[PDB]
Design a protein around this nucleic acid. Sequence first.
RNA 1: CAGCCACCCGAGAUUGAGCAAUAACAGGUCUGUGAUGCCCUUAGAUGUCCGGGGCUGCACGCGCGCUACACUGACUGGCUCAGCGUGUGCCUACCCUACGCCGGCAGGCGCGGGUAACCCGUUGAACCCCAUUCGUGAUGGGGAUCGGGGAUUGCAAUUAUUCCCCAUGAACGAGGAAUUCCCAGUAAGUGCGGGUCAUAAGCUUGCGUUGAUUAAGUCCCUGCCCUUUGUACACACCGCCCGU
Lengths: 55, 189, 126, 138, 143, 72
Amino acid sequence: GHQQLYWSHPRKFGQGSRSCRVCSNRHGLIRKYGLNMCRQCFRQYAKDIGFIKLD
Amino acid sequence: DIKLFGKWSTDDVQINDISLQDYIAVKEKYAKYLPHSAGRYAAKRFRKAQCPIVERLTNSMMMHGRNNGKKLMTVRIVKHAFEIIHLLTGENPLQVLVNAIINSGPREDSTRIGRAGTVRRQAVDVSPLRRVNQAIWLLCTGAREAAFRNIKTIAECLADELINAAKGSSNSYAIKKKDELERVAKSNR
Amino acid sequence: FRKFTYRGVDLDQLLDMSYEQLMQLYSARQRRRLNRGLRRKQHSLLKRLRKAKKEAPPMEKPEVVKTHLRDMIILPEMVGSMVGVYNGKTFNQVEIKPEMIGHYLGEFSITYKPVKHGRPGIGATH
Amino acid sequence: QSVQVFGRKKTATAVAHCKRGNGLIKVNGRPLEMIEPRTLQYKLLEPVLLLGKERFAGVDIRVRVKGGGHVAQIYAIRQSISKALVAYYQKYVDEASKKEIKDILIQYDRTLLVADPRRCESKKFGGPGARARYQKSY
Amino acid sequence: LVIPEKFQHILRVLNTNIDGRRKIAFAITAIKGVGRRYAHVVLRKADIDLTKRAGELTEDEVERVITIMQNPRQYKIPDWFLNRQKDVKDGKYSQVLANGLDNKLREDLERLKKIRAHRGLRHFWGLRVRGQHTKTTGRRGRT
Amino acid sequence: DKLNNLVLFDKATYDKLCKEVPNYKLITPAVVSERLKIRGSLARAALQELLSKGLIKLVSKHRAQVIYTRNT
RNA sequence: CAGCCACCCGAGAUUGAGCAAUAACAGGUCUGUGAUGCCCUUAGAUGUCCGGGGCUGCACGCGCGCUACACUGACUGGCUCAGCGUGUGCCUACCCUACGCCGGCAGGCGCGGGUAACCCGUUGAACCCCAUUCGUGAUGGGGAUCGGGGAUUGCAAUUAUUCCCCAUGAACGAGGAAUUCCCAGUAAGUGCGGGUCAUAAGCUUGCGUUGAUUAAGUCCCUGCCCUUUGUACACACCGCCCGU
């Protein structure tokens, strides 16, 4: 009866399925302004986001 | 009028060191109603002597990681013991202050001297600026330890140390430190 | 000889007593599940324990119950029987006694463990 | 009239509205004799009695303040008062006594007219403070 | 009311001896539950001047304080403000003075080991209750 | 360590205290406590009580610096 | 001369940081990755649908740091001053959050305020502004060590993990040798914010607030190998090499 039993428990607090939006990676997710990436993808892809370094 | 805190007269001080009023000054035009002007002299050199020495005190009994950032407390605590020396000796606190700065102020110290040896020390002359710095440091160290863990409050331990250092009394911790400096200068020629 | 009670009430009284002053007897636990409500997959454990309790062998303990779910329980009807609770790879056997009420079933599952026994030896000097 | 030209210290500032009034100086609904720290009142009466309490002969000065820190407001409230006095004394009346009082308060100190450009620097990562760094692990 | 000479070293609990040097609002901290803000509030609402000292500690004061500490409902004080709300192993609601009756309740090490509970075993070895994680770090106990 | 001080009301707070504090020129709770063997806390309490009696001249008040001088 | 040191004016006579070479490492990361090399993995698939333990252990060695040892002070409370920010939304309830009723403690419904300097906000804030027992202690410095109860985001708080009320004063009298870090709005004291986030900070990253005598020097004993010099090394001293 898995067809009506599929996805029984709503996992809403966890980010297993809400991990970094790029790939199958975790351990360092940041939700500043809703990035939903880890540090790796953000830093390598920060040139297209619009975040620049002049501090 | 430019009297200190509006109650201690400033036209009465006599350093009596021939030529030292440029390195110990409470008469100078920088001497203001209060010893609070915020830190601006420490940036450059030989500008520290232009400080009104009341400010140097209220910042020297201002230390030890429990007082830093509490300068208004230091100004209140110097008003305290200024109005207390006003009655203990019956004279202006500036006179006993200059007496303390002219006696406690060291002359001879001992330092390591040489490019190739490390055996002993050599006698050196401590300049007026460094002498007032270390004299006020000894005064504040005594005043901290004299009221540390003790029932005696501030403005009286400081007061006692100031009065028995201003007259040249060797009973003072600062004056015994001065004597120790002089004797170690004797014992390391 | 020594006297033990549950603050003037027993399982029978608490069965007769409604939840009104039961909440006053409740420490802090298992109260908000009523306001939250019970979800699906949660109707068979009570039936299974009651069915087991109906037939109790003479001079023998109630039949072992294999449970893989930590089920929140709201009533003392469990007290007076035995439960086979979860350890991690086996099912450990538990006698129920008046301490069960005032506590949760999951509080009897204590499982934690070291690596091995040893002392600082040849490898570790400093 | 608004002859206000700032008067500042740190991030706190004061604006010294000046007019032909009663000679009473007001600080946002409270007299300068009563300020929250209860300790810097002499720092506020310093300029007026240094240059002379007789100068105020019907001049109403209301200073409005805004910024962080009480003592940070002071050294700027009094700076604003001195600026307002300078503007009033430059607008119509002579300069000889203006230069006299200016020399007197300039030899008194420097923080009555010209602001302190100092400001709190940023903190650099890899340490607890801007210049302090963590302890070395051996 | 006010009297210069009432200073006595001992207050009566179970005929034992206590200290009597502490001042008022602090001399009744010798009781296990009374003290802190409990003694402060009972003296605060006791309708007496609190400037009194140890020497002016009257017997009427002590009698009223003992009565007020017997039951909390003198000023309608709830039982949880005392160290003991509804008791364990009995249906009482009050803290008991002296020793051998209240401390009998605290021994909570065997029965939880009967149900193989973690709390009883933790209190059996004298370990941490707040849950201080122990890996190697710690400088108390053996040195 | 060990707390043990004078808490008894006897001929120490009125006599030798009201007869030796007025005659001295500097009066401080610490000074009264040290020079008259008395407790500083009770020194403050008694000084407040006698100020309520009105036999001193007050300059300023603080938690640790209450400035008194002889007036009468 | 390049320049260095003093001085008057002046807001300012060294404001702070990101960019930073040629060339290289066998320093860490295959546990960051839908970027990847023979072995176990050939469906007997070290999580994969569901998900009920695991880096959540006790005898001790100076691993960044934490509140203190007190009277420059914790402490009834009087007065009142902040700046970066963060903020209702794709399998994203949950974000801030102006009142009535109740409820000390978190929180129930509503009229609304907010995509934003419009809403909290005038971050009324917060450190301090010293009128209260406090006096050298085991009580009020030192919640660091007990059992009960209201409960909001959390089916699942079992090591009250995290939101508090009563009781618990152990140790610490500013601490050996070796020894971090600090020149101006700096060190330092102080609270707010972002990261993680069931609403979450003893950590880190920013911000303010309060705010020094620290010396405008030398190379010690610390590294950085610049010049001269020696070399039998060039895999470059973790080299080379002699003999039993």
